Design a protein around this ligand. Structure first.
Ligand SMILES: N[C@@H](Cc1ccc(O)cc1)C(=O)O
Ligand SMILES: N[C@@H](Cc1ccc(O)cc1)C(=O)O
Lengths: 370, 370
């Protein structure tokens, strides 16, 4: 009865939204992704992903392996489109790779790390809510966010079941004919069986999130394209191999838009080759105990004129009109770092909050700042 | 106290045996293996395996994947040295690959198959006991036989634990640079992830048998050499990665003779290329409902003069002196098929029992036999 009525109202709301998009009254979140610059590679055509996003209140996820006690600003990039979807009323999850960090992604303390990353994600998600309220988005019952740790299934998930459900459908050649698996096996050491199996586990992760939460979309870091391709194979195998006739009603695809999709975000460097979120020989951590707020703000205020508009698009919830006005002010006199102070203000506001942001800005407008 | 006293007497008996071998009073079972022709390839040096067998009442196993409801005579070959060890007072196991049959060994109904194979192995093991008594071997408390199904661990064994315990130690290159994995991936279809993982599961099987039963030796079919090499890596990884300090006392090797070893049996064909145990386009099944006893006996009575001594050595418990006397009678007039009737009599006696054997011999000595 009553969850059902609410689900029905949600779908009806979603469908009026869908029609509004078809008529051009409302921008498709997919086209927002393209406009702001989040799309590098897609697993699924852009027409596919657009239409899935228009017609269905999907779930989406980003996975993070807790390889250290703090996230850094480089982690923010895949999270940003995820947060945009959340603001738009999708279901959005950050998956902590508690079990999968121990294998480690080859593309190219641990419990305490897992605890700290959960804490930090919860803190950031709360700042997203704050920003959602500040940017004028209305409450929506069907809007959902969550934090999931893949140890929830990996602690007991039988190997046999994974091999039976997906292992016969996945051929090792495509896994092997992929640049990471050819790279570190030619130049660099070898690939461990555990390393080789990592993409299969991440694919099973996606299956579990599809099954449990309706997650049809994975958003990946810039180097996650191969893992996403493999993950789709794993999820497809798993949905097709479901033995129970009753579960198949729910899990086996019937229609084209039932399929899963994904995309990756761009690789961000400056014109000197530096990786975004690295300032010298260290990360810009989200933890103030590791990187002071002043220094976090500093990182952003030092961004280049050449990259700053692109970074305002990626790392803020500023409407494009707002960014355009900022850039119009900024080019009057770039030496004033209007755009960079805006970027710093917005990103600090998201990670550390408005008060910390104001204080840091005041400090960076002193006559000496380092 | 009392299992302990019995274990101590067993070890003392084993050590008098060991000294008797060192002094040449008693043949090392390893040298029996060599004399009778069971040794093709060894994982571990022959000096290693010999000394392990002299000094330690090891456990050994043969794995069989239940891919059909009956075993056939080709299955007997790896079982024979295993049965010899049993007669000599080792611990000897036949492992049914209940879970691993579903993946299937790539080297180159299902529940009912598992039930029938268990039944047949139990029946054969009982005939081994009969033969043990008939060949003059004395009761030994420490002599042990068993039938184990790897579904005992595979039904619930977590993938994560397997990957953490062995997955980092096993490199995919050696797995990949092996002829089977290069064969069916070049010529022939692909290799499924499940296929590629099969040797890891069989290696974990061996670990479970080492842990549970003290099994240090695997005997393999003629094509199982690669699987045995991989299995040793898996068992070594697993014994070295045991996290508990108390378990390490028992599971982590301390000495050279603590290591696991294995060997394979020869590939048996006749001079026309036919696979041993194939008579035309069908197997010679151990099940009388599939291959009559008459026809089973017939298969053996038709063996060639060129191969019959070799087959008496492999497929019977006849002392070498007995086989020599048989061959001395046989060469007086080969047309009488003395040696072949002896081979038929002995193998039928093992699989179907002495009464069935006598009847089949009488039938094959009629003036018309097909
Ligand atoms: N493999 C990703 C993280 C990840 C982990 C688990 C997942 O299910 C998804 C993504 C990385 O290292 O960047
Ligand atoms: N792989 C072997 C059978 C086997 C199965 C499991 C084991 O643990 C050992 C051996 C075969 O097909 O001949």
């Amino acid at each position: 009865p009553k969850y059902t009525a609410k689900i029905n109202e949600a779908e009806e709301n979603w469908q009026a939204r869908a029609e509004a998009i078809k008529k051009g009254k409302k921008q498709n979140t997919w086209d927002l992704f393209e406009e702001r610059g989040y799309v590098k590679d897609t697993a699924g055509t852009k027409e596919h992903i657009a239409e899935l996003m228009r017609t269905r209140r999907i779930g989406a996820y980003v996975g993070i392996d807790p390889t250290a006690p703090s996230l850094h600003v480089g982690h923010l990039l895949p999270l940003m489109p995820l947060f945009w979807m959340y603001l738009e009323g999708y279901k959005a999850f950050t998956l902590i790779g508690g079990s999968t960090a121990k294998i480690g992604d080859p593309t190219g303390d641990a419990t305490m790390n897992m605890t700290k990353i959960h804490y930090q994600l919860k803190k950031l998600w709360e700042n997203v809510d704050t920003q959602m309220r500040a940017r004028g988005y209305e409450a929506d019952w069907a809007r959902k966010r969550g934090i999931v740790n893949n140890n929830h299934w990996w602690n007991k998930q039988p190997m046999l079941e994974v091999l039976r459900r997906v292992g016969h459908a996945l051929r090792i050649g495509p896994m092997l004919s992929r640049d990471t698996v050819k790279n570190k096996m030619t130049q660099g050491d070898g690939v461990s069986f555990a390393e080789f199996t990592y993409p299969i586990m991440q694919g099973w992760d996606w299956f579990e999130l599809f099954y449990q939460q309706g997650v049809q979309m994975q958003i990946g870091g810039s180097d996650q394209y191969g893992n996403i391709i493999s993950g789709l194979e794993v999820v497809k195998a798993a949905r097709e191999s479901e033995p129970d006739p009753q579960e198949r009603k729910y899990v086996t695809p019937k229609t084209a838009l039932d399929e899963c999709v994904g995309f990756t975000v761009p690789l961000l460097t400056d014109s000197s080759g530096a990786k975004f979120g690295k300032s010298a020989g260290n990360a810009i951590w989200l933890d103030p105990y590791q990187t002071s707020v002043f220094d976090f703000y500093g990182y952003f205020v030092r961004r280049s004129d050449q990259e700053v508009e692109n970074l305002l698009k990626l790392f803020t919830f500023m409407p494009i009109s707002e960014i355009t006005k900022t850039m119009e002010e900024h080019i009057k006199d770039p030496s004033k770092r209007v755009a960079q102070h805006t970027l710093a203000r917005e990103v600090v506001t998201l990670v550390h909050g408005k008060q910390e942001a104001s204080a840091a800005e005041d400090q960076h407008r002193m006559m000496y700042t380092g």
